[PDB]
Amino acid sequence: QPVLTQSPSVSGTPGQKVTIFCSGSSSNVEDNSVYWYQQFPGTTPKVLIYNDDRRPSGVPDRFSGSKSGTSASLAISGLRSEDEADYYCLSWDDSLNGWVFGGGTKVTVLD
Amino acid sequence: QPVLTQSPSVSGTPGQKVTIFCSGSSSNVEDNSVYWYQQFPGTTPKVLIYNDDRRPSGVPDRFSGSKSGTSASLAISGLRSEDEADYYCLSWDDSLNGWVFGGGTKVTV
Numbered sequence A: 001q002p003v004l005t006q007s008p009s010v011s012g013t014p015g016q017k018v019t020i021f022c023s024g025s026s027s028n029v030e031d032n033s034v035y036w037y038q039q040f041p042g043t044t045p046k047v048l049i050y051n052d053d054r055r056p057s058g059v060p061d062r063f064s065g066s067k068s069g070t071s072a073s074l075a076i077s078g079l080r081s082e083d084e085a086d087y088y089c090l091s092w093d094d095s096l097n098g099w100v101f102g103g104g105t106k107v108t109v110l111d
Numbered sequence B: 001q002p003v004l005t006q007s008p009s010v011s012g013t014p015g016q017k018v019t020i021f022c023s024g025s026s027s028n029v030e031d032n033s034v035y036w037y038q039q040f041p042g043t044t045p046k047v048l049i050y051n052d053d054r055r056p057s058g059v060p061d062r063f064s065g066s067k068s069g070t071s072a073s074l075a076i077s078g079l080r081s082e083d084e085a086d087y088y089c090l091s092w093d094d095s096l097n098g099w100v101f102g103g104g105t106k107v108t109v
């Protein structure tokens, strides 16, 4: 099982602001840099957020990240159809001494 | 076992320029971004290199990374007892559809 907890699936319509969550513990999320990535089926992930809240140049400005204690979050401010994908969080874990991951949150853009 | 190949260890003495190697395949190292991190004992890892050869701000120009074909390397110019950590490469792998890692190169000064 993934050591970090993400809700498996979220829906929304274009334009809606949706935030997804990544819950960990004192020995991971709380403690350590959190990274988020976006994965479409069959292709290489795109890093959306590194070091908790930093957005690479080239990632659309509607994506932002932050960390509140044992919980990290990724906000998508104005969902687009092209945002339908699987979103993962990860960080180092002090107690397992290696990388830990959420199980991914699949975002569906409806209408 | 780690999918990328690294020397399990590499001893050295202050002053000299060491090089850590990381070999993989066309579906990982060649076709994907390589990252390097450094892990001191009981300390959170620091990324020294992203996208093959770029340094995060706050990382001494004295680490450099690069790659050719299916292998990557991190050159540590001008050692220090401070640089005594375990150094790791990683990248996405298209064939496994997942992340792959080197086994780490424990540097000794």
Ligand SMILES: CN1/C(=C/C=C/c2cc[n+](CCCS(=O)(=O)O)c3ccccc23)C(C)(C)c2ccccc21
Pocket: A035, A047, A050, A055, A056, A057, A058, A090, A099, B035, B037, B047, B050, B055, B056, B057, B090, B099
């Ligand atoms: C540790 N780690 C990872 C780190 C990724 C780090 C960074 C990814 C992208 N940028 C680019 C932003 C600058 S720019 O490109 O906008 O100029 C960075 C910049 C500075 C430091 C780190 C990064 C990934 C790869 C997430 C990963 C995956 C699996 C396990 C571990 C693991």
